[PDB]
Amino acid sequence: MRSNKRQIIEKAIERKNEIETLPFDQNLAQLSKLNLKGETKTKYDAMKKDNVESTNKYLAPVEEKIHNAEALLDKFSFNASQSEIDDANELMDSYEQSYQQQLEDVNEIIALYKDNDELYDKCKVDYREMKRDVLANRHQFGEAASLLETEIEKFEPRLEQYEVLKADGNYVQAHNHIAALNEQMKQLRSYMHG
Q: 94 and 152 in contact (C-beta within 8 Å)? A: no
Resolution in units of Å: 2.6
Domain boundaries, the chain: 1-194
Closest to 68 (Cα-Cα) out of 87, 45, 40, 43 = 87
- Enumerate the H helices of the chain as residue ranges: 2-19, 24-32, 38-54, 62-74, 78-136, 145-153, 155-167, 171-191
CB-based contacts of 32, cutoff 8 Å, min separation 6: 44
Gap between the Cα atoms of 165 and 172, Å rounded: 9
Elucidation technique = X-ray
Gap between the Cα atoms of 129 and 47, Å rounded: 42
Gap between the Cα atoms of 121 and 127, Å rounded: 10
Collapsing DSSP states into helix, strand and coil, what is residue 108?
A: helix
